[PDB]
């Protein structure tokens, strides 16, 4: 964990956080960050074990909700979800850069290379398929990011900065599950009293604001994982986050077989550097088998994505309709 905090300080120096590190008003906040390592058992990788927590102290701990040992670990599960997403995205980026560099090397030292044409075609198409996979991944990731950041900004503008530029909506309504809309409490007059500072929140009010914010985060349908209140996708029998985790596992297997294919291609490249098309026939056969495997994985994932689109369209939510249309 000393190399860990060293890398943390270095990344802070590279990022704009160094500015906050320079300002003493922000050094206290930047020092309150304390990464944590969760005991997930022996044999796992750093991409699955490393967590990023923040340690708060009074008088701050009495307002902001942290991943307390007796809490619900909202930030913990959210960071784990975003961490798996970022891990998939980084793996896609690594495969992309490896493929791009190796194809650039081919183009540099191909000369004529007549027998490579078909292989180059296959590699281009497979990189396009990987690009489509990464596009779907980053698409779901960006949709999640958009919804999350929308929640954040609406919270700031309506909960953290409510007393500044209020909504002016003096009407407090309550929606019932049977479509009934009832006015909450007594109706106040339009500020007219016979006549002839800031409505700010205290400790517990701000803490309840934070907790309701976390709840609105976790109460999202796509975040409603393994709950009886969520509806499962039609013709699938599985909840939407369940099918999402299944698709994440599928695309991770796709990334791994793509890494294997890239290793095979690098070995074939080294062989071409060694001799001029006199060997690597077994490597060509293994390349063909990996191509067939990748095609099968792509077909299965496309069927799963079509089922997911059908579920989003038939769920009733217009936002799911829009997401399935955009994926379509």
């Amino acid at each position: 964990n000393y190399k860990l905090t060293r890398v943390l300080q270095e990344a802070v120096q590279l990022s704009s956080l160094r500015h906050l590190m320079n300002s003493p008003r922000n050094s206290s906040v930047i020092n309150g960050l304390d990464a944590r390592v969760l005991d997930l058992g022996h044999g796992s990788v750093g991409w699955d074990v490393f967590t990023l927590d923040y340690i708060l102290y009074p008088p701050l701990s009495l307002v902001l909700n942290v991943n307390r040992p007796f809490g619900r670990k909202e930030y913990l599960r959210i960071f784990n979800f975003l961490w798996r997403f970022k891990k998939n995205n980084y793996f896609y980026q690594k495969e992309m850069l490896k493929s791009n560099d190796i194809i650039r090397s081919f183009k540099k030292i191909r000369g004529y290379n007549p027998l490579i044409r078909d292989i180059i075609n296959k590699l281009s198409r497979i990189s396009i398929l990987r690009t489509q996979f990464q596009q779907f991944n980053s698409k779901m990731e960006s949709y999640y990011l958009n919804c999350i950041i929308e929640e954040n900004f609406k919270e700031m503008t309506r909960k953290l900065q409510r007393t500044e530029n209020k909504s002016q909506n003096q009407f407090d309504l309550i929606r019932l599950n049977n479509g009934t809309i009832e006015l909450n409490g007594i109706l106040t007059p339009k500020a007219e009293v016979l006549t002839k500072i800031e409505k700010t929140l205290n400790i517990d009010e701000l803490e309840s604001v934070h907790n309701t914010f976390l709840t609105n985060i976790l109460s999202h349908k796509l975040f409603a994982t393994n709950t009886s209140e969520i509806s499962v996708g039609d013709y699938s029998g599985q909840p939407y986050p369940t099918s999402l985790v299944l698709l994440l596992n599928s695309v991770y297997e796709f990334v791994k077989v793509y890494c294997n294919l890239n290793d095979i291609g690098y070995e074939i490249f080294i062989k071409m550097n060694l001799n001029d098309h006199e060997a690597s026939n077994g490597l060509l056969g293994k390349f063909n088998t990996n191509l067939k495997e990748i095609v099968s994985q792509y077909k299965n994932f496309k069927d799963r994505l079509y089922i997911f689109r059908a579920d989003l369209k038939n769920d009733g939510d217009e936002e799911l309709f829009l997401l399935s249309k955009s994926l379509r």
């Binding site: 909506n169 479509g179 009934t180 009832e182 006015l183 109706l187 339009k190």
Partner: protein, 311 residues
């Protein structure tokens, strides 16, 4: 509380007073949804219509609390069914309604009886406006589709089939629109004007509510509406027959364009069908004419009489 703005809002909502645009837009946006919810059962999902309604309410200005608190609901009974429930009359369409949860202290003046009256009047106006919208859509399909305006092949059909149904649609328009203008001017307009002129320097809020309920009663106790309801229940079925006939003829027009005598036999079937339909409409019109001539109370009545007098 500015009671004048609230009463203006409720007149716009439940009475359509100076708000025909909003309700017309809502009807045009979801004609298909209404017909698919009225032809199906209660088990059919209407959540799409509810989502459209809440979206329209969100696009509504937040100051209009009467429209911001507007809530939609589906009933298990039809409008003539609840009319038979509340009034001694004899009647799966028009199961929709809208309601408002009047808060304190506004609930002590805006009671639930006036709310039920508003719901009844709103469902009635919705029926009327949907029928007028169906007539407008029929006229649009007739005057815009090229097959309807197209003629040829020694027609014998345009003058007999097209001209006849056009005259029939004209008759239905001269009936529905006439009675709508009559009810909205001699009843709706006069009651709106009285409601406007009464709150000028008021004395008792209970007196205001009593005047409001008395106007609602005069709207309900109108002999024209009571005489129309049973005849309306048949005129609307005649309108449904007319529009399904229009759809069938529109589907047949593209096929009749040029060789087979079976097509002529189908044309004979259609001409006897529409002649029988016109005769049935004429008989229902004569029945309603007898019913209104037996009524006693007459300007708009004389106008409707002139409309129903055969040329």
């Amino acid at each position: 509380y500015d009671l004048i703005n609230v009463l203006k809002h409720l007149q716009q909502i439940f009475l359509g007073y100076q708000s025909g645009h909003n309700v017309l837009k809502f009807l045009t946006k979801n004609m298909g949804e209404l017909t698919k919810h009225y032809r199906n059962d209660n088990n059919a999902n209407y959540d799409k219509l509810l989502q459209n309604f809440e979206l329209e309410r969100q696009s509504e200005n937040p100051n209009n609390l009467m429209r911001q608190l507007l809530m939609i609901q589906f009933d298990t009974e039809t409008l003539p069914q609840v009319l038979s429930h509340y009034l001694q009359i004899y009647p799966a369409i028009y199961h929709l309604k809208f309601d408002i949860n009047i808060p304190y202290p506004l609930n002590i003046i805006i009671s639930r009886t006036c709310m039920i009256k508003y719901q009844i009047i709103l469902r009635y106006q919705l029926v009327l406006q949907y029928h007028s919208r169906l007539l407008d859509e029929t006229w649009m399909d007739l005057n815009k589709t090229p097959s309807w305006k197209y003629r040829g092949y020694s027609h014998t059909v345009k003058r007999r089939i097209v001209r006849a149904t056009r005259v029939l649609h004209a008759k239905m328009n001269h009936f529905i629109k006439t009675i709508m203008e009559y009810f909205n001017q001699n009843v709706i307009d006069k009651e709106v004007y009285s409601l406007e002129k009464c709150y000028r320097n008021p004395t008792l809020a209970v007196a205001i509510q009593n005047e409001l309920e008395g106007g609602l009663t005069n709207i309900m106790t109108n002999r024209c509406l009571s005489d129309l309801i049973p005849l309306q229940l048949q005129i609307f079925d005649i309108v449904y027959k007319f529009c399904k006939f229009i759809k069938s003829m529109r589907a047949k027009l593209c096929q009749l364009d040029p060789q087979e005598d079976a097509a002529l036999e189908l044309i004979q079937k259609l001409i006897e069908y529409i002649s029988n339909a016109s005769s049935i409409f004429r008989k229902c019109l004569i029945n309603f004419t007898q019913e209104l001539s037996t009524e006693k109370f007459a300007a708009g009545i004389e106008r409707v009489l002139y409309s129903i007098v055969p040329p």
